[PDB]
Amino acid sequence: MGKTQKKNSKGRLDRYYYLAKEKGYRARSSFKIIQINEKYGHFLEKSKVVIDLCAAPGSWCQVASKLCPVNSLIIGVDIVPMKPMPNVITFQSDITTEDCRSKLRGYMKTWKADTVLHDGAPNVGLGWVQDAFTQSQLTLQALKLAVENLVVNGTFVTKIFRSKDYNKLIWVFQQLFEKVEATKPPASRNVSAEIFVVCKGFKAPKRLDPRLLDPKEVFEELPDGQQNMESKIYNPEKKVRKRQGYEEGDNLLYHETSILDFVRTEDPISMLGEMNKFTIDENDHEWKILKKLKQTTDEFRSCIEDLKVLGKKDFKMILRWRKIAREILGLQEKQRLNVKRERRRKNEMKQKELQRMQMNM
């Protein structure tokens, strides 16, 4: 810390920055797509139509212009104003709205872009819990723009901030492209969490599922299936702080079942570590049978009224009680083998004797 300027950092000023300044490039990031294109067989030279979303201030557009065919159609879309560039059509509009669709359709008369390359990023400094997710949302929006402007067997290049919602983007990319692979060029300083994923071989389906590109359920969370085993033996373990919310259908945060349900269940470990109480019915014939036992006494019922203050020595006792309650409620083949073995032994002995005949030369 120290509230120092970003330009005063140790790695903020780099050889790539000065190289871009010397070359006329507007950013060192222009070198990234320079190296990535050099990794995948110069796919910009074979594109002839380029769409660059979030291209402030046009470094990637400059690289495409210098690499793509002379009269190509590099089109840059931005939310902030962009300095005009020769032979590049740049305009300002938010990509997450129908205004961008209308403007792109106006500019995309009939051609379909052979490549879409996206390098958007939010204003980092919010906390990285929202920055990574909003960058992933930006990448998904860029994919939604690209899917309707890419020919079959197209290339889509995007930058993702690595986070928990990154494998989901990779999976979604794999469902729409032939080969999906992530990489990190040298001019992507190794302190950064950005990773550049490129996907080639656009499938271009006739009837694509819109819900596959809808963030409402692309970023759906996953459930848990923990064993719930340490809660019986390691009760005083100071369990990991429960900071993952509660169940959707849980309001009292409390559970209770009949003791006979515990007796008849197949999983006692799961039920002991989840319930808060086992209910006793005093007008049930099964409980009438189970009451007149050597068990169900000597501090057993009190351990049942609260399954959260027991410990291993009491859980084992309850399990033993449940076990008690459940208990209450030919010659020719041998001759052929001998013959073949005798033949093999005779042959081996003959060979060994013949060999020993000739080891005194």
Partner: peptide, 28 residues
């Protein structure tokens, strides 16, 4: 010669230049 200037980034048709990224007066 047209291909060389095209590689340099000069859009020319038979030869007159429409638009060049770099000046033609210094292009070898």
């Amino acid at each position: 010669l047209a291909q060389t200037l095209v590689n340099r980034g000069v859009n020319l048709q038979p030869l007159q230049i429409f638009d060049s990224q770099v000046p033609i007066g210094a292009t070898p």
